[PDB]
């Protein structure tokens, strides 16, 4: 227990069912075709249906929710964005030209020798980068008035076809000369050399020396596409392109220059960026001098030790529900089956290992079976047991668990076992609800995303995937009325704030709201 447990106005039991969504279509809907009388009552009258997919939880529009994103958003009380989502939103709404770090890189150039470098993987593979981000950056840097911009094109062939690079090179060349009339291609080199992540500095050195010294084949805008096509016929593909050099010494990285790397994945950026921006050029052991007074910038942060500013730096995830309750000196309980323990732990608590002060944990072991359709109740009963024991104790004014059956059985695709899963989950919830009533907890049932509600493809085939359907949010306490946000659908990010409002605890500013209940 914790010193301010008595300040709590209403103790709360939160259940996160895993893979339990709301769908009107009953064909292959294991929740609808399962005896679920407990949830059928809890999901009626005062109850809400909230989003767990797509942008509502920091994912690309249209993408199904999943267990990690779900538990992250639930426990965080804010939307937890993917980096790629953050970047693409910024492209949609012209927020590059106001980006503080990008404005910083550009101002430094403008008040120095004004030379800027763009370097990254040029393709639409979308794993490490996107060429549209590169395009969007050139336009931005143009608007901001940087005098000179040179581009260092890293060839892909791994997240795209090995002979796709000519197309992106053509498309880059036309963009710079006809669309922006600004920016110049200075280098082409394969990601094999520039985006090594196994500390093979002899590979990095190839891209290093090309950028700073022009160690490659000379070409120009008129010839460069032919060079690459000749390389293809020599059996050298995008990934493995040896360097090509386009603007002479003007396009090299020189003294006092600024560099922006536009990849948003870090592992394959740490080496080239540390070679340019710290002391790792020494590992390349080049006979070339290292330029003086460089400053590097990254689309994202590649290593917190690095001094590099970032266009989209990491969110700290400060004052997620678990940390915040401990700050208020209120104690808590987290419980789950094996298969979902990282969800009520690592991910609920912000995506780290921290178990905060006053946080008590319980791991109920999952059954040892080959597939979970062979025991579709899994260990939900045991999880309920431990939760009911905490309700009898009354020690923790906030307790929570996860029930795995609906998701983990849904993934098998066996429709009738899914039905059993949801039946066994519903019985478990019913046991806790009885206990909350007897020991005066308010019960709240939600889910992290759907799954069980769609078990069949239109044609009857197995459908094992997660869904984009909304999920329930129930509240047994009759002095509150559910109310939607005025500006958006409610979403997982509103579970934690709503919890704190029922508990009479303040909300921390990092929790970008919002309680979706109001008192009667
Ligand atoms: Cl080589
Ligand atoms: Mn799953
Ligand atoms: Zn899940």
Author numbering: 20 to 539
Per the authors:
Phosphoglycerate mutases (PGMs) catalyse the interconversion of 2- and 3-phosphoglycerate (2-PG; 3-PG) in the glycolytic and gluconeogenic pathways. The enzymes have no amino-acid sequence similarity and differ in their mechanism of catalysis. iPGM is comprised of ∼510 amino acids and facilitates the intramolecular transfer of the phosphoryl group on the monophosphoglycerates through a phosphoserine intermediate and is the sole PGM in nematode. The iPGMs are monomeric bi-domain enzymes where a phosphatase domain, structurally related to the alkaline phosphatase family of binuclear metalloenzymes, is connected by two hinge peptides to a phosphotransferase domain8. The glycolytic phosphoglycerate mutase, iPGM is an attractive target for the development of broad spectrum antiparasitic and antibacterial agents owing to its essential metabolic function and evolutionary divergence from the human enzyme.
Although soaking of pre-formed iPGM crystals with Ce-2 caused the crystals to shatter, we succeeded in obtaining two apo crystal forms, monoclinic P (iPGM-m) and orthorhombic P (iPGM-o) lattices of native C. elegans iPGM. These crystals provided the structure of a nematode iPGM. As anticipated from primary amino-acid sequence homology among iPGM orthologues, C. elegans iPGM is quite similar to other iPGMs of bacterial origin. Similar to other iPGMs, Mn2+ occupies one of the two phosphatase domain metal ion binding sites while, as in alkaline phosphatase, a Zn2+ ion was found in the second binding site of C. elegans iPGM. The identity of these transition metal ions was verified from phased anomalous difference maps calculated from data collected at wavelengths of 1.0000 and 1.9016 Å. These metal ions contact the histidine and aspartate triads as shown in Supplementary Fig. 12 at coordination distances listed in Supplementary Table 6, and the catalytic Ser86 nucleophile coordinates to the Zn2+ ion. From the apo iPGM structure we observed that the N-terminal 18 amino acids, unique to C. elegans iPGM, were disordered.
